[PDB]
Design a protein around this motif. Structure first.
Motif, PDB file in Angstrom:
ATOM      1  N   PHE F  38       3.748   0.442  -3.054  1.00 23.55           N
ATOM      2  CA  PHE F  38       3.737  -0.726  -3.934  1.00 23.55           C
ATOM      3  C   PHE F  38       2.543  -0.852  -4.872  1.00 23.55           C
ATOM      4  O   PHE F  38       2.303  -1.963  -5.360  1.00 23.55           O
ATOM      5  CB  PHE F  38       3.867  -2.023  -3.110  1.00 23.55           C
ATOM      6  N   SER F  40      -0.508  -1.425  -5.188  1.00 22.80           N
ATOM      7  CA  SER F  40      -1.647  -2.336  -5.159  1.00 22.80           C
ATOM      8  C   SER F  40      -2.909  -1.623  -4.699  1.00 22.80           C
ATOM      9  O   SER F  40      -3.938  -1.661  -5.381  1.00 22.80           O
ATOM     10  CB  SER F  40      -1.349  -3.524  -4.249  1.00 22.80           C
ATOM     11  N   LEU F  43      -5.523   1.146  -6.837  1.00 22.86           N
ATOM     12  CA  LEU F  43      -6.740   0.839  -7.574  1.00 22.86           C
ATOM     13  C   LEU F  43      -7.919   0.567  -6.651  1.00 22.86           C
ATOM     14  O   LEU F  43      -9.069   0.666  -7.090  1.00 22.86           O
ATOM     15  CB  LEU F  43      -6.510  -0.344  -8.517  1.00 22.86           C
ATOM     16  N   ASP F  44      -7.660   0.238  -5.383  1.00 15.98           N
ATOM     17  CA  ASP F  44      -8.694   0.316  -4.362  1.00 15.98           C
ATOM     18  C   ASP F  44      -8.919   1.744  -3.891  1.00 15.98           C
ATOM     19  O   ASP F  44      -9.974   2.041  -3.321  1.00 15.98           O
ATOM     20  CB  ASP F  44      -8.325  -0.557  -3.162  1.00 15.98           C
ATOM     21  N   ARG F 110      -6.653   1.470  23.262  1.00 17.41           N
ATOM     22  CA  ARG F 110      -5.861   1.941  24.388  1.00 17.41           C
ATOM     23  C   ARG F 110      -5.173   0.787  25.114  1.00 17.41           C
ATOM     24  O   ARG F 110      -5.777  -0.253  25.383  1.00 17.41           O
ATOM     25  CB  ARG F 110      -6.758   2.729  25.351  1.00 17.41           C
ATOM     26  N   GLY F 114      -1.545  -3.053  33.792  1.00 16.60           N
ATOM     27  CA  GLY F 114      -1.658  -4.406  34.305  1.00 16.60           C
ATOM     28  C   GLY F 114      -1.817  -5.429  33.204  1.00 16.60           C
ATOM     29  O   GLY F 114      -2.610  -6.368  33.343  1.00 16.60           O
TER      30      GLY F 114
END
Lengths: 104, 202, 97, 152, 80, 127, 105, 60
Positions: F38, F40, F43-44, F110, F114
């Motif tokens: 997409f 966005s 550009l980062d 991880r 339990g």
RNA sequence: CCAUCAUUAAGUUGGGCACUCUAAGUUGACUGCCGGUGACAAACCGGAGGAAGGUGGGGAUGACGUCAAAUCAUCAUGCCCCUUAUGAUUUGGGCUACACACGUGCUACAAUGGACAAUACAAAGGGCAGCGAAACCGCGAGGUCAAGCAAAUCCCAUAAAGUUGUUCUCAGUUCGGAUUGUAGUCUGCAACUCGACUACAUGAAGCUGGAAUCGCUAGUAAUCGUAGAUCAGCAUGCUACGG
RNA sequence: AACGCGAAGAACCUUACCAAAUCUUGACAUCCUUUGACAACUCUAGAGAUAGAGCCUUCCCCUUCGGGGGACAAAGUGACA
């Protein structure tokens, strides 16, 4: 038979007893209908060609006549599949503890 | 607290295996032949100062190494009982070839011996606190560093079970360097079973 | 030729790979040395309690260390290491020809 | 560690279109259930209707609309027991930024239209024109914290 | 329970072929939990052992869709 | 001229190279806007060579491997950052102070037994 | 204010199932004026010595435990309800010191 | 109780549907591992004691 | 595992490219190193130095002890009891029953969705007659044989959410799918008590939930699908896995 | 700190429970005695285990005689299980 207008025919024939998503394929097979047929469809010459294919089906109400007597036959023999109808029992071998509510 | 056994930390980390074979196919059934001859070696020897055994299997010449704090008693009189052992050990399995035995010095610093010989000081029913103190005082006298041992149930002959441990020396149970060796025996006294643990170090 | 080297320990499968790479270069070989195949581990998750308790359990694992040795100069002096069975302790060798 | 001291607050990445940190923080709050793309597309189609119903570009309109959302006094409860236990406290600048974004989205979800294509943009132009539903609860805080002014 | 071989108990079919030849006897003590009802079973009476007490039942012609074990109750429910 | 760097983030390795030319990326031998979903975060993703200003200088043509789309991205901006320090080696402080050249700092945690999944303890009724 | 009753090797009767709610139930219903809780009654027989009764009632903040080692399972609850009624008053006077005259500056 | 069920297992049953598994020294049938044929109790025991071959403890 | 060679059906084949990657044997992070005004008393506070920074993240490991805490049904044994049975042996029930009452989860009550078409990207693990491809024949669950293989290659296996486009239009409507009759698919001496799916039917409660209450401090809450142990067949559970 | 916990797989088996059908040296183990030395396989009757017949009467060495060791357990109890 008693279908409603102002919607698409792929969902419109579903409103009667005995049709769910077979009008997308089976009614679309015999009749030369399309998907985008609203109330403005002129389905009167197409009413005849769907009448020929719905006449082979048990759908419009008359299936519920045979469906009712199949339970009536099943309780008359008094089977375990049939006693669970006459007794609120889930019938298909389910756990009749706490989460068995829709048969009460 | 729930102290787990000190060997289980260290199997492969700072120790090695009491069975060092490999079998990819049919791993199950020929693993049972181990504890067949771990019961069977512990049957007829019947505390012949046996600490623990090792099993190694290679090309139908399956080895058995026993430590035997009293050496020669498993050998017999010049290779008598060691040959009298392979007359039955080679019948319970197929081959059992190359049965042998090595020796150990410091007969009661291996913890399997230390737990066992004072558990057998309980059928004669004599002074369990000295039976403790006999093991502690002799331990670093013979060359150990840290000693720790207890007795759990039907302690002294009474009704209520009471643990009773005696300790001195560096026993680092949480340090993974440490060569801690423990053992558990099953001393019966005809009013239940007494359980006895030990902990040696170096 | 693909001599399969797989074992449970890692110190043993490495020192037995040093045996076969030494006892082949003394003969007329051109050994592509030991490259490590990825270990095919397997985790077993038992529960710790004698009777009741889940929500507190001990996991167990067992690891096989896989390597392979292949030679492409077959002489009768090279197969003296193949016929010569050494280090049979905790390593199996699936000799293919 | 909220009792050793304060937590070190972390940096965010500004938007590529508007070149604004404030847009990306609006993306993350409308991001229901971790879906980044399916929520960012809606914001990128909820300021075009802003720029359709007003000639100005929406990066001016956004920071103009939130100023009618961001309050200046709020209520922090102090456990005084039998007292009012509602102290009117002014807002720190970090919470000043966040709590305006919160009211802008939480009342955008309760409108007549179903698509957030125009659920969001209607409340923005209401907040741009100092009206609507997310503005009127700022005044509700400014009729509650400004009614119990005996605890300045 | 495929098309291939609709199942019969077959230690009961051997005991019913002696019955349908001449005049039928009105009891077959059996178990019959495994077997289906096909038209070579009509008329005959089976004492189906429900775990506690073998319950008599005779076969009708509308019974062919179902199987023999589905009739003798084992719950002993009535209760509440 | 092929300045070949690598780069990892979030269980996804990304090896790059630097052929001269202009800014054009060919991730898995296809276009970026048809591969990354997409547009966005691209550009980062151009942030590392932004501080060395080599926009119309280098074609890259990444071969990426594993992970997801934000795991393939944020690993080629770390991918070319190891390759930008063999293009502009004196510009290491421009990338050290601003972002890209740090690490693969963190992956998924991880699942402890339990427990439901990955430090989220299950609900109990009686407090 | 339910009573999940269960007896270790003792068959519970129905005369106990009315004697519980009059004393364990009703005398703590007027305490805890916004109530929604579950009680727990153990009855553990020991053939060597006696029986014992354990009553645990958890609440929002502080629970309520008591034990009697009597054999009479009707006279022992006369002491369980005594220990229960003492512990609630400890809980309430702990939180009924809200009445502290503190005038702000 | 226990060794009757051990004796029931080791005989060949009439049916392959019965196909019943237990352990060689553990009396319980209900936690078997078909590579080990051990109960979860003693497999925890004899791996701490090392009688099984190479099996690490934990903490991958 | 294929930048540079191409005859890419991609055989990732020819060479080996071994370079990167990956897969495994080892070097390194400790307040080592500075500045504070901070006085020496260690710390703390702020830098730089490496990829990493202040017990890096996580696991394993749980002191003395508390609770006559939980198992004489994994075992093992003091005492007590049973010995034509309280031990045995069989197919047939039951452990799955229900006017109900609390725990724990699954799926939802939608147009940041639903239905249909296209189009991507994983990790972990399994496969000792077991995994069973590509073809077919079936609407489908699936059947028939060989292709490979006791496996970094062969198979389970095309992950899904996503992204792209067409749609319904804001209703208990194309929201979901509980429950009942029709397929008899497959496993197994055998699916009635008492399985597992899919096939056309039927379509119920349900419009985000009161008092209360629980989880969670970054790759974490949240969600999305994939594996394995059990196992002939069977999880909405469990345990691991990544997005 | 019990309640998707022992159950990491209840159609039969599991199964410990119940109703039936029949067994007491017992489906298991041990001394054992004659080691009677496989009723080691099919038909019939059967809910079905079981019962009745058809039956592979043996198995290895090493003497010289037909015993002992592994030989199957048809019967046995001091016992025991």
């Amino acid at each position: 038979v008693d279908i409603p207008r102002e919607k698409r025919v792929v969902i419109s024939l579903t409103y009667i007893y005995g049709i769910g998503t077979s009008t997308a394929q089976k009614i679309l097979e015999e009749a030369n209908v399309s998907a985008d047929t609203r109330v403005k469809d002129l389905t009167d010459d197409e009413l005849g060609r769907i009448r020929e294919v719905v006449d082979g089906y048990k759908v419009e109400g008359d299936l519920r006549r045979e469906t009712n007597l199949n339970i009536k036959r099943l309780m008359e023999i008094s089977s375990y599949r049939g006693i669970r109808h006459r007794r609120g029992l889930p019938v298909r071998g389910q756990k009749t503890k706490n989460n068995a509510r829709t048969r009460k | 607290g729930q102290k787990i056994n000190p060997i289980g930390l260290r199997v492969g980390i700072i120790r090695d295996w009491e069975a060092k074979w490999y079998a990819e196919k049919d791993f199950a059934s020929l693993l049972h032949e181990d504890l067949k001859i771990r019961k069977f070696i512990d049957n007829e020897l019947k505390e012949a100062s046996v600490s623990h055994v090792e099993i190694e299997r290679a090309a139908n010449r399956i080895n058995i190494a026993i430590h035997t704090g009293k050496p020669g008693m498993v050998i017999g009189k010049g290779g008598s009982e060691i040959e009298k052992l392979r007359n039955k050990l080679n019948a319970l399995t197929d081959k059992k070839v190359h049965i042998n035995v090595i020796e150990i010095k410091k007969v009661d610093l291996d913890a399997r011996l230390v737990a066992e010989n004072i558990a057998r000081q309980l059928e004669n029913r004599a002074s369990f606190r000295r039976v403790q103190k006999q093991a502690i005082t002799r331990a670093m006298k013979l060359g150990a560093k840290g000693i720790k041992t207890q007795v759990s149930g039907r302690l002294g002959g009474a009704d209520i079970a009471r643990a009773e441990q005696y300790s001195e020396g560096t026993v680092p149970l949480h340090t993974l360097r440490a060569d801690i060796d423990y053992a558990h025996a099953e001393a019966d006294t005809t009013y239940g079973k007494l359980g006895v643990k030990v902990w040696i170090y170096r | 030729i693909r001599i399969r080297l797989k074992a449970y320990d890692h110190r043993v499968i490495d020192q037995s790979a040093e045996k076969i790479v030494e006892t082949a270069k003394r003969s007329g070989a051109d050994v592509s040395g030991p490259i490590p195949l990825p270990t095919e581990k397997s985790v077993y998750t038992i529960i710790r309690a004698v009777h009741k308790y889940k929500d507190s359990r001990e996991q167990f694992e067992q690891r096989t260390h896989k390597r392979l040795i292949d030679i492409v100069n077959p002489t009768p002096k090279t197969v003296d290491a193949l016929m010569g069975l050494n280090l049979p302790s905790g390593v199996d060798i699936e000799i293919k020809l | 560690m909220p009792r050793k001291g304060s937590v070190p607050k972390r940096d965010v990445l500004p938007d590529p279109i508007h070149n604004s940190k404030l847009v990306t923080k609006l993306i993350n709050k409308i991001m229901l259930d971790g879906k980044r793309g399916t929520a960012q597309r809606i914001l990128y189609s909820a300021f075009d209707l802003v720029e359709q119903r007003s000639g100005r570009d929406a990066l001016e309109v956004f920071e103009e609309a939130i100023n009618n959302i961001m309050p200046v006094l709020e209520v922090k409860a102090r456990r005084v027991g039998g007292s009012n236990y509602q102290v009117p406290v002014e807002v720190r600048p970090e919470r000043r930024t966040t709590l305006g974004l919160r009211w802008l989205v939480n009342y955008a979800r309760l409108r007549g239209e179903k698509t957030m294509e125009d659920r969001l943009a209607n409340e923005i132009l209401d907040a741009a024109n100092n009206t609507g539903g997310a503005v009127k609860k700022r005044e509700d805080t400014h009729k509650m914290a400004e009614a119990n002014k005996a605890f300045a | 329970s495929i098309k291939k071989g609709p199942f019969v108990d077959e230690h009961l079919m051997k005991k019913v072929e002696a019955q349908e030849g001449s005049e039928k006897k009105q009891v077959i003590k059996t178990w019959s939990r495994r077997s289906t009802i096909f038209p070579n079973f009509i008329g005959h009476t089976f004492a189906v052992y429900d775990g506690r007490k073998h319950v008599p039942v005779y076969v009708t012609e509308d019974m062919v869709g179902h199987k023999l074990g589905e009739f003798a109750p084992t719950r002993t429910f009535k209760g509440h | 001229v092929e300045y070949r760097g690598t780069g990892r983030r979030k269980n996804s390795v990304a090896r790059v190279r630097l052929v001269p030319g202009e800014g054009n990326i060919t991730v898995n031998n296809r276009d970026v806007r048809e591969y990354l979903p997409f547009e966005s975060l691209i550009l980062d993703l151009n942030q590392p060579f932004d501080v060395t200003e080599t926009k119309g200088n280098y074609d890259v043509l990444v071969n990426v491997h594993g992970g997801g789309f934000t795991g393939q991205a944020q690993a080629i901006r770390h991918g070319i950052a190891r390759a930008l320090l063999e293009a502009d080696p004196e510009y290491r402080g421009s990338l050290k102070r601003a972002g890209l050249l740090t690490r693969d700092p963190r992956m998924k945690e991880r699942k402890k037994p339990g427990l439901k999944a990955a430090r989220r303890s299950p609900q109990f009724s009686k407090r | 204010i339910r009573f999940e009753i269960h007896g270790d090797n003792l068959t519970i009767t129905d005369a106990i199932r009315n004697y519980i709610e009059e004393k364990i139930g009703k005398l703590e219903r007027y305490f805890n004026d916004v109530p929604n809780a579950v009680a727990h009654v153990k009855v553990k027989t020991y053939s060597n010595s006696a029986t014992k009764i354990e009553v645990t009632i958890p609440l929002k903040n502080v629970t309520l435990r008591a034990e009697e080692r009597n054999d009479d399972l009707y006279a022992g609850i006369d002491l369980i309800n005594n220990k229960l009624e003492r512990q609630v008053r400890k809980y309430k006077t702990r939180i009924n010191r809200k009445s502290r005259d503190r005038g702000d500056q | 109780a226990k060794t009757s069920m051990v004796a029931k297992q080791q005989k060949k049953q009439k049916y392959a549907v019965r196909e019943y598994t237990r352990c060689e020294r553990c009396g319980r049938p209900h936690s078997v591992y078909r590579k080990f044929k051990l109960c979860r109790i003693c497999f925890r025991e004899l791996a701490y004691k090392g009688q099984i071959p190479g099996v690490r403890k934990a903490s991958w």
